[PDB]
Amino acid sequence: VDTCSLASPASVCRTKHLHLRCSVDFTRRTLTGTAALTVQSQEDNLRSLVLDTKDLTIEKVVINGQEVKYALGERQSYKGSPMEISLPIALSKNQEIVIEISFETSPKSSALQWLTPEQTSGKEHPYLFSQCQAIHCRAILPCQDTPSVKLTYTAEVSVPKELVALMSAIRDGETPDPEDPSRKIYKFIQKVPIPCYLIALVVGALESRQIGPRTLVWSEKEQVEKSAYEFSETESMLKIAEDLGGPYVWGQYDLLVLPPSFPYGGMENPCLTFVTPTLLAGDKSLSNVIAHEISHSWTGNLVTNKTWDHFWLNEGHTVYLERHICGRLFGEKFRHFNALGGWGELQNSVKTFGETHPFTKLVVDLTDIDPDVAYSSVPYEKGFALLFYLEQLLGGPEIFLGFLKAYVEKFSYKSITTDDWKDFLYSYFKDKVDVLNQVDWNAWLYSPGLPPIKPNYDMTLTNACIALSQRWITAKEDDLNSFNATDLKDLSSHQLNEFLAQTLQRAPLPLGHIKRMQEVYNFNAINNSEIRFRWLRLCIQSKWEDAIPLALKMATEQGRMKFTRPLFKDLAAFDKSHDQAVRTYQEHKASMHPVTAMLVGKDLKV
Numbered sequence: 001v002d003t004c005s006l007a008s009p010a011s012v013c014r015t016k017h018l019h020l021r022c023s024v025d026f027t028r029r030t031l032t033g034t035a036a037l038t039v040q041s042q043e044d045n046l047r048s049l050v051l052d053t054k055d056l057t058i059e060k061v062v063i064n065g066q067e068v069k070y071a072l073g074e075r076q077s078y079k080g081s082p083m084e085i086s087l088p089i090a091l092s093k094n095q096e097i098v099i100e101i102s103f104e105t106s107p108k109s110s111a112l113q114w115l116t117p118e119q120t121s122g123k124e125h126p127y128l129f130s131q132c133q134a135i136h137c138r139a140i141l142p143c144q145d146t147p148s149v150k151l152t153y154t155a156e157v158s159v160p161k162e163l164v165a166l167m168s169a170i171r172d173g174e175t176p177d178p179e180d181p182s183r184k185i186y187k188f189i190q191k192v193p194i195p196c197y198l199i200a201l202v203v204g205a206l207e208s209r210q211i212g213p214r215t216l217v218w219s220e221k222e223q224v225e226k227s228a229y230e231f232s233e234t235e236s237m238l239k240i241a242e243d244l245g246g247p248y249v250w251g252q253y254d255l256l257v258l259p260p261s262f263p264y265g266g267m268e269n270p271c272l273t274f275v276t277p278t279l280l281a282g283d284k285s286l287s288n289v290i291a292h293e294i295s296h297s298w299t300g301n302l303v304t305n306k307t308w309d310h311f312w313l314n315e316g317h318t319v320y321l322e323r324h325i326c327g328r329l330f331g332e333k334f335r336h337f338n339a340l341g342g343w344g345e346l347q348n349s350v351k352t353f354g355e356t357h358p359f360t361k362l363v364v365d366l367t368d369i370d371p372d373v374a375y376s377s378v379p380y381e382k383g384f385a386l387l388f389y390l391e392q393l394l395g396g397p398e399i400f401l402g403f404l405k406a407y408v409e410k411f412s413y414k415s416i417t418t419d420d421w422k423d424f425l426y427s428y429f430k431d432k433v434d435v436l437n438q439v440d441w442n443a444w445l446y447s448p449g450l451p452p453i454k455p456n457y458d459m460t461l462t463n464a465c466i467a468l469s470q471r472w473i474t475a476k477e478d479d480l481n482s483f484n485a486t487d488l489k490d491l492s493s494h495q496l497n498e499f500l501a502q503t504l505q506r507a508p509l510p511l512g513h514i515k516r517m518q519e520v521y522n523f524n525a526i527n528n529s530e531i532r533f534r535w536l537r538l539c540i541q542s543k544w545e546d547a548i549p550l551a552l553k554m555a556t557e558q559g560r561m562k563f564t565r566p567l568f569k570d571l572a573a574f575d576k577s578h579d580q581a582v583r584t585y586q587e588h589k590a591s592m593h594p595v596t597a598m599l600v601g602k603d604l605k606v
């Protein structure tokens, strides 16, 4: 049961294919066109079915060349409105028909952000991008908006001729639009069956540069050269991922670097990963995000969570593979360092939510819960900790990687639950079932709070970070003079970040200590977004008014929710900046991403 979807479930009917024919209207901020769904009955005598929609205007529904009856039910909040379609002839089991729906989206579509020219790099043209995960595809087109259903798709997208459209699919040509010579039609094909949350579209002034045998980077012209360098490890990571996961089946692996309001670090859209431009550190230091998105090409896009209650299957396994890729590139001690950092992020989330909160369970129950509200580090890092614990229990990384590749092979092109995963784990490790029975499954999978057992972590790269954090924390005023730029001499950017993460866990520190830290380390000069984020949080939580305009600037000049949400919350919690924090949100909200605007407003109680 997919409690996030109002559509007929997969046991009743299933979409096999979507043919999308649409036009992007920047004057009206609407997409208008037809969604032709090829649907296969799973029941005898099927006479109706229901699709998910959200803020869509339906013009008509056509089957066998005739208009048919349909009805839109009452809106159910963030789930949207169910659309019931009256089939003209009762279908037998396995029979397939094509249902062609004429629709138009709303400018407030929660799947979409429409940007004016001023919100782009080039300042001449507008830009549109989508983000369907988890349940926003219904705000673009009517569909069974559940990851329990997989479908292929084709699309034809008409756009102003000076712009470029891309989708999560192989590019299948471009022509002038016969209905309007001021336009171009871009065509697409996704021959591999996917869940509809992986449908993606961007329209803008995009240019491309090849950076590997199967990878172009796409962005506005101003970002191309920098993106090419930043993500140059992409091919080497794909080769390692193929070694761990089996064949890459999607053809191309292209990258799209979005404008700064993109809400996530990345989105694993097939053939075309979307990334934040906050990855552009200049030194490739945030490339774990690329490794993560690459890994989703197996865990998530091939083996998929059957409902969003089982999101940890997607995310936990992906973090596990991510950390292996980075460990192959940079060493097993670095994999452990990153693993242990992730446990720290899990501590933070559990402390933030509260150790008994339902969203700290590994498997969650999203009945009446908006996935965007529930979203956190938990499925990522509690899922990873479980897998890392199991790795250690069952004989080490070589052995557990054998399981992972067998698991991907077994469930490719399928959608699964936590029970499916656990059943297969027991089947694969049939000779170690004694050891598996030692795991407290009920606590790991279903209980809130920190896991019942913490894995073992190599400390080599972490010790210097803890040591320095502890010096600052225990320092008194007469110790502040001993600190100096040389303290950071032998620390990588990853280690500087972890030093800040350790210190932030003990915040506030005294204002004088934070002033000294800027004096000796000049953190204000660091443009690395992960570093700058934690530094500004530490400054604001420690009540440094000088940091207020810096934090406001970072919160608004980009929109990755990982950074924007906690910066606004911190600024709201500081009495000196509270009124400005809400004013700034109020002023910006109309031009923010619709999901980000929603969540920041809830965070700020405005």
Ligand SMILES: c1ccn(CCOc2ccc3[nH]ccc3c2)c1
Residues within 6 Å of the ligand: 133, 134, 264, 266, 267, 308, 309, 311, 364, 371, 372, 374, 375, 376
């Ligand atoms: C990374 C890139 C896009 N997203 C969208 C958020 O999606 C989800 C999906 C599934 C979820 N289960 C619980 C919260 C939750 C949130 C997260």
Ligand SMILES: [Yb+3]
Residues within 6 Å of the ligand: 476, 478, 479
């Ligand atoms: Yb002293």
Ligand SMILES: [Zn+2]
Residues within 6 Å of the ligand: 292, 296, 314, 315, 318
């Ligand atoms: Zn992910």
